[PDB]
Assembly symmetry: C3
Homo-oligomer: 336 residues x 3
Amino acid sequence: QDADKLPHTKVTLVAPPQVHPHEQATKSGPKVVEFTMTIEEKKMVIDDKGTTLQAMTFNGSMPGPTLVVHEGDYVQLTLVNPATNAMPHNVDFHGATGALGGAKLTNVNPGEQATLRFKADRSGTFVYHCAPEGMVPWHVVSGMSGTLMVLPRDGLKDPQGKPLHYDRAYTIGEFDLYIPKGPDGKYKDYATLAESYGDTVQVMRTLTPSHIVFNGKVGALTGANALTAKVGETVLLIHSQANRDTRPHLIGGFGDWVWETGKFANPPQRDLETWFIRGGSAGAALYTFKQPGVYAYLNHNLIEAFELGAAGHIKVEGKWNDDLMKQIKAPAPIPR
Amino acid sequence: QDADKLPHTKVTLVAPPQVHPHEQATKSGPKVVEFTMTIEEKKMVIDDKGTTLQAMTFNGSMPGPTLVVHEGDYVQLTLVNPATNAMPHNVDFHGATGALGGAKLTNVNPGEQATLRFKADRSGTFVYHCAPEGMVPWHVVSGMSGTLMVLPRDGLKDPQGKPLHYDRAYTIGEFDLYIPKGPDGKYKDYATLAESYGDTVQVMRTLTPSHIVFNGKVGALTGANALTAKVGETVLLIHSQANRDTRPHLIGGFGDWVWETGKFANPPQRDLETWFIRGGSAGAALYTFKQPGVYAYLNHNLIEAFELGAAGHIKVEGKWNDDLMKQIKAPAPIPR
Amino acid sequence: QDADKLPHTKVTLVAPPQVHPHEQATKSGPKVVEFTMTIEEKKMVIDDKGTTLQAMTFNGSMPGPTLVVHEGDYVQLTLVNPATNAMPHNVDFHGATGALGGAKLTNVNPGEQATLRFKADRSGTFVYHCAPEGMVPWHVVSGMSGTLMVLPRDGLKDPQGKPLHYDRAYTIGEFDLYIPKGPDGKYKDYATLAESYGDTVQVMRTLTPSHIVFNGKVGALTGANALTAKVGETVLLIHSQANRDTRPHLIGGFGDWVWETGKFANPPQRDLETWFIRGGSAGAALYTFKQPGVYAYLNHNLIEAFELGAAGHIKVEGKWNDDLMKQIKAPAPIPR
Ligand SMILES: [Cu+2]
Ligand SMILES: [Cu+2]
Ligand SMILES: [Cu+2]
Ligand SMILES: [Zn+2]
Ligand SMILES: [Zn+2]
Ligand SMILES: [Zn+2]
Ligand SMILES: [Zn+2]
Ligand SMILES: [Zn+2]
Ligand SMILES: [Zn+2]
């Protein structure tokens, strides 16, 4: 059970909100699963008013890509920090044991890379995030976090041990953003990442985000970019929040089976209307669509969702079921 | 199991904090349970300093009345929006499947009504709330939410399946209010509901409520309006919070059995000191009183409870039990 | 099962973060366990910038000491309020039944003491806190809270009933502080406790702490005062938050078994990355160290931890395990 001698497999990561191809239940034995991520600092437009964020990302996206392995596997990540970045970075896996989650072994300055291996000995969805000494919160709130999903080798199970399956998985990273405003009441636009620092820490200390977004920007998961599913399909919704609590809800849907603390050896709860993702964690919910149409998937602090940005859509195809819901009488004049 | 052919029964709703008469375990088979609610926009005094809220309610109260059905029943609601209101409304049931919880099928302008039917296929306490396109949070924080309680046909059960009963049920809706202040530091008083809109959204975006109240106003559940019980009686406390998290606590009491996520097919937790209601959900706790006196039932963010309003009282009659608690020595001079 | 006739034992309390010596599983039958606490109002330096807090404490510390008993025992506390204090105090045990948790029977003015006895009939970690009529939140946020740990007579158990043991226990009280600032942007320093009142309530109503600290001050559990353990040792981390939610996380570690709502008759959850302590409660986590080094134990709202103070360290001795984590390649130039 010595990793140096086990089979190694390289996985190509995909951008959120998709999740790379993977097995749920597997007959494979433990492997060393190798991944690579390249840090990209970049200015991003995060709303439809032209507001920018001096952002920091793993692999160019918020959140970074989800890495999927099985319980008993070893994660082996090569973390690259190009010379075109200005700051030092690292990675802290909440699914790993020791050395500040791997942060102490992955400190990389612009122009450097490092490779970390850790045993993924516990099943569940876990946050990973950057955590450079002296500026931990700034790197995390600027976009550096994603999820490691460690599946049970047997796939997911209900409280009685019955198999649970998903047909499609989506990953939603929710980001509380702290964009500074100048004395004119407009959001500041910085020329460099380092310029935004001091102002940003002052907004952070208020504990009041200027924006709260799914996947890098207001409305990121809407329009052409809406999530999709079909009636009859079971979706796994992974939701990570590395800094602040959130409370996911599917409008017109449910959390059929939910691991809100995100740890698959614990029995899931069923029939949830709204679940809770503790800041610093990732959780997962399964839902099997039974009705077609456009659903909203959102943080059910409704101010945070509708005013600040924490809401996406899921467009679902299929047949309407009047036994589950029916309009008996459409809107019409009150009988007088 | 076609609702069109099932027996229909009409239920008369009662104002919070009571809950309409209903059975727990029932021998009845599935029914279509019909309810009616009329929306009332009205200015309300919400504190004892004369502060007003341009409020929006279902049936004239905050929260709206609790509707009680059994798992497998169909809820059939007629939603009326009189011409004396100024805004359009709808209803989103978190206990319903599809069409944005029914909101898409219940859009009613002043002078209109509509009737929605949905299968209540999951047990638990669920929030219902208004959700008109473009102004979802304003309608919810202005007072439009209540609970749908779907009881298991067999009544409530503990983790081992033993029957649990309540003698009386109370419904507590907790509302985070965002009342604007003018430049003189006083809460603004508006002539119309529409006048309060813009100022209200600015306060909402700060995420800091001006007041947090149970059942429409500071001290609503105190004095003549305190909840009541007797030693030996088991109470079911339903607590809904449609927009913001809260953490209920009974001072001098416990959550004997609690479903904090509010979904009765999951095993309850026992002996809770304080439980947690996620914004966008309703939860339920059972407690059997063992001591008489005046208890406080509150949000245990104590600033939110004592400074902002989120606290009520329960006056309990009966005999004091010195085996559970006794004053050994009353306050007296320190022995010198 | 009449307490007046049972054996009485006096326990000497110890300062946080230690916990007085006690048994886990015990063959003892029910006892009356007697404790004494003396209230101390005192000005404390709470950060490294010279900021002071007009603090209020049980036994001179924040949090007050943890009291440990077994399920079925009676807690008998003598609460002393010296004449050198300026305010009246009391104590509300969340582990007690009736009389506002004992607050109604322990109102003591400066120069008085009182003795309360209550049956500790439920297992779990429970908050105790001061709660004087009319100024409940001020006394709690100024430092008056600690934990009562009621262990099952059989010791802690996992979800299947297997015994769980800890080798060492630590108690962490997390305090959201509301220090006023004057017009010059500097934290105010008061000559007396009563002087700080009005300004403090205004900061409290904003719901934004100026500081959030573990055990009375930024960095209290760091340096010479860091918690300690060894590889192979199982630690019990008790975390109390009497006013505000928090989300504990061990960097590079886990919550192997966690009772986040803190009530030991409920099955714990395993493998948690981050858990949640509801304001007004205490929870407990067990972790068996598997790697040596310096860990951080923190509130995983990272702004609250790193900017506001809610973070401590645990220094762990022992052997590094390259099978759990290994640096495959140290930071070095990117291959060109
Ligand atoms: Cu970074
Ligand atoms: Cu409305
Ligand atoms: Cu006090
Ligand atoms: Zn399927
Ligand atoms: Zn972390
Ligand atoms: Zn009864
Ligand atoms: Zn909703
Ligand atoms: Zn041990
Ligand atoms: Zn309390």
